[PDB]
């Protein structure tokens, strides 16, 4: 079986790396608005449906090709999704929309053991995103891997709170604190990136795109072998957990200083080392259409002592170095604009290791 | 100035608490052999250079995190050293070695007034230990504190008696009595924990790691404001004074019954209350790689009437209680294995009080 990964750190052998080609600006609908900084709302309002700036995409393609070269150098087998034009307008009986991209495999695929799981997603523009990854998945399936697709939502109006009172990121943080998100509990929905793996224990956060029904589905589907825990944070990211609580080793986690975890004591009690990374140094003028500046901690571990970290972020590089972790510096400053760092731009398919508990 | 501590008992306000992360078993060299029980010599011989048992370290991390929680509860500001991988092999022109840990701030930092002093150390594996504390110290310095580093030894062969005829702890006690230690008087060397503070009078013991040149340096450096006295004991601990003669208040001291002080009468004449604690109850099967079972009396005073004492050591708890001293029980049974109790795992940076004499 070519598929086999129980955590985020065991020696990496095979990975799927995303594509920047033909990425499209999603139409400005409520769920897009609730997952982006106000600074860019007018960009979405105007550019929605068109491709992301092509000169910018071109630099990202180059950055990602180099990253793939380095992965091969580091002994990792790299697979890439199929090229697709994401501008095609599709129409289900519930809605009509254009696509986004297949830049982030971590948003849609999660590997638990020998099982590859396709997340349902929660954005109308990401409904048919799975199409880019099917060739790779069918191959793993032919070769023995288990293949699962969580229930694809209808994404009917009922899934969204069309009147979500958000006018600034400050409002959303407040609502998020009151348990109010743009997604209702009408049906299961979630992005795989809201889940982070540590062997028998998987951690999830209810976010703007991952509801409790979505987490319960995962929980029910993986029990009894795996345990899915729900954790929360202060001023959380609207979507995705990997630049907020990145588990980098057995009992070691990077905790974003701006998004403290409410359940941090569960981890201190388990004897876990909580490391808080230094601040990012990325220029405020550099466009980050999605995500925040914290992509610096969105690292990918090649193994426990080897991390792929952004070439520009010297301060977090030094941190890893004083920790005895070898830094493989790669520059993906332009790829970052699409919404992700090393962890998001990949999906670890096979890591050499076994299923263990680290929470004891 | 955030730094200000003249003794071991005034109301505690700020403290630095050590780290168990990445601790490494020191290579088995002569000075390590002379500072440990024969029972563990083969452990050092085999494990030297590798990390201390990780499952054990994990329990210690948890115990220390809880201790920090309680300190914050008791109103104390807690600082922690930087995480560092102690397995890195460094090489000076005199020797080559791997590190130990930054578990015991008391071994390397001593605060006298508004001055923070970095001890030179005497173990080759603790040469670059100061690196974990530099961020904290530079901060205190920016904020007005005096900062001093005693002369870092070369730790060349000349500092050690490579042929120190020790085969059992019984031999070392005999040699110690003859004035023979593993460290020569080739150059100054010392651990800060061999010094204990009582306002204008500081007490030191020449031990396996603190030589007369080291004590004289302290004496000469602090005169005339402070007076450094040398005291001795029967069957002394190879290193550190804080589990042999722990001064817990103005004119009150805990005197280890197994290590009577030769100069006890100087204290009786001063009108000091010498208390001899009851015996420890720690199981003989529990590993104590460094130190002895007497860690029970290695208490830390939050103030004159509040002591942080081990949760398991009920007998010494009762003693403090009949004395009217409130006991704050914390369990650090696994942290103890690293070589220290509450006093060793901390360094009091600021205690509310003034410089006084208690020996009159």
Curated annotation (Swiss-Prot), chains A, B:
Instruction: Enumerate the InterPro entries for this protein.
Output: AmidinoTrfase
What upregulates or represses it?
Expression is elevated in the myocardium during heart failure, and decreased in inter-uterine growth restriction (IUGR)-associated placenta.
State the EC number(s).
2.1.4.1
The entry's stated outcome for residue 168 to C is: Decreases glycine amidinotransferase activity
Q: Cite the active-site annotation.
A: 191, 240, 344 (amidino-cysteine intermediate)
Keyword annotations of the record: Acetylation, Cytoplasm, Disease variant, Membrane, Mitochondrion, Mitochondrion inner membrane, Phosphoprotein, Transferase, Transit peptide
Q: In which tissues is it expressed?
A: Expressed in brain, heart, kidney, liver, lung, salivary gland and skeletal muscle tissue, with the highest expression in kidney. Biallelically expressed in placenta and fetal tissues.
Instruction: Give the domain section of the comments.
Output: One chain folds into a compact single domain composed of repeating units, five beta-beta-alpha-beta modules, which surround the central active site.
Its name, as the record gives it, is Glycine amidinotransferase, mitochondrial
Question: Could you say what the effect of mutating residue 171 to G is?
Answer: Decreases glycine amidinotransferase activity
Q: What result follows from mutating residue 170 to K? A: Complete loss of activity
Which family is this protein grouped under? Belongs to the amidinotransferase family.
- Disease field: Cerebral creatine deficiency syndrome 3: An autosomal recessive disorder characterized by developmental delay/regression, intellectual disability, severe disturbance of expressive and cognitive speech, and severe depletion of creatine/phosphocreatine in the brain. Most patients develop a myopathy characterized by muscle weakness and atrophy later in life. Fanconi renotubular syndrome 1: A form of Fanconi renotubular syndrome, a disease due to a generalized dysfunction of the proximal kidney tubule resulting in decreased solute and water reabsorption. Patients have polydipsia and polyuria with phosphaturia, glycosuria and aminoaciduria. They may develop hypophosphatemic rickets or osteomalacia, acidosis and a tendency toward dehydration. Some eventually develop renal insufficiency. FRTS1 inheritance is autosomal dominant.
Q: What the protein does?
A: Transamidinase that catalyzes the transfer of the amidino group of L-arginine onto the amino moiety of acceptor metabolites such as glycine, beta-alanine, gamma-aminobutyric acid (GABA) and taurine yielding the corresponding guanidine derivatives. Catalyzes the rate-limiting step of creatine biosynthesis, namely the transfer of the amidino group from L-arginine to glycine to generate guanidinoacetate, which is then methylated by GAMT to form creatine. Provides creatine as a source for ATP generation in tissues with high energy demands, in particular skeletal muscle, heart and brain.
Q: An example of a Gene Ontology BP annotation on this entry? A: learning or memory
Q: Which GO terms describe its molecular function?
A: amidinotransferase activity; glycine amidinotransferase activity
Q: Which gene encodes it?
A: GATM
A single Gene Ontology CC term: extracellular exosome
Catalytic function, reaction form: L-arginine + glycine = guanidinoacetate + L-ornithine; 4-aminobutanoate + L-arginine = 4-guanidinobutanoate + L-ornithine; beta-alanine + L-arginine = 3-guanidinopropanoate + L-ornithine; taurine + L-arginine = taurocyamine + L-ornithine
Subunit field text? Homodimer. There is an equilibrium between the monomeric and dimeric forms, shifted towards the side of the monomer.
Q: Give the recorded effect for residue 191 to N.
A: Significantly reduced activity
Q: What is the effect of changing residue 140 to S?
A: In CCDS3; loss of glycine amidinotransferase activity
Please name the pathway: Amine and polyamine biosynthesis; creatine biosynthesis; creatine from L-arginine and glycine: step 1/2
CDD domains xref list: amidinotransferase_AGAT-like
PANTHER family registered for this protein in UniProt: GLYCINE AMIDINOTRANSFERASE, MITOCHONDRIAL
Tell me the domain of life.
Answer: Eukaryota
**Modification N6-acetyllysine occurs at:** 322
């Amino acid at each position: 079986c070519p598929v086999s990964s129980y955590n985020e750190w065991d020696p990496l052998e095979e990975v799927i790396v995303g594509r920047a080609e033909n990425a499209c600006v999603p139409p400005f609908t409520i769920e897009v608005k609730a997952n982006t900084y106000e600074k860019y709302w007018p960009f979405y309002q105007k550019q929605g449906g068109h491709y992301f700036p092509k000169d910018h995409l071109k630099k990202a393609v180059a950055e990602i090709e180099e990253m793939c070269n380095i992965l091969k150098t580091e002994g990792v087998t790299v697979r890439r999704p199929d090229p697709i034009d994401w501008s095609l307008k599709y129409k289900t009986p519930d809605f009509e929309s254009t696509g986004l991209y297949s830049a982030m495999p971590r948003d849609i695929l999660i590997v638990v053991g020998n099982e590859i799981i396709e997340a349902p997603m929660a954005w109308r523009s990401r409904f048919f995103e799975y199409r880019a990854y099917r060739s790779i998945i069918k191959d793993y399936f032919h070769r023995g891997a288990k293949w699962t697709t969580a229930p694809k939502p209808t994404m009917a109006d009922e899934l969204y709170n069309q009147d979500y009172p958000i006018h600034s990121v400050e409002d959303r943080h407040k609502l998020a604190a009151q348990g109010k998100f743009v997604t209702t509990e009408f049906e299961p929905c979630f992005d795989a990136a809201d889940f982070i793996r540590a062997g028998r224990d998987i951690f999830a956060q209810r976010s703007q795109v991952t509801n409790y029904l979505g987490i319960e589905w995962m929980r029910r589907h993986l029990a009894p072998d795996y345990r899915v825990h729900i954790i929360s944070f202060k001023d959380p990211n609207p979507m995705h957990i990997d630049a907020t609580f990145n588990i980098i080793g057995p009992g070691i986690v990077l905790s974003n200083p701006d998004r403290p975890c409410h359940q941090i004591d569960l981890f201190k009690k388990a004897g876990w080392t909580i490391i808080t990374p230094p601040t990012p140094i990325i220029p405020d003028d550099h466009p980050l259409w999605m995500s925040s500046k914290w992509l610096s901690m969105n690292v990918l571990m090649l193994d426990e002592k080897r991390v792929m970290v952004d070439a520009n972020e010297v301060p977090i590089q030094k941190m890893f170095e004083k920790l005895g972790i070898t830094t493989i510096k790669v520059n993906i400053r332009n790829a970052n604009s699409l919404g992700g760092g090393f962890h998001c731009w990949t999906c670890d398919v096979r890591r050499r290791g076994t299923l263990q508990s680290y929470l004891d």
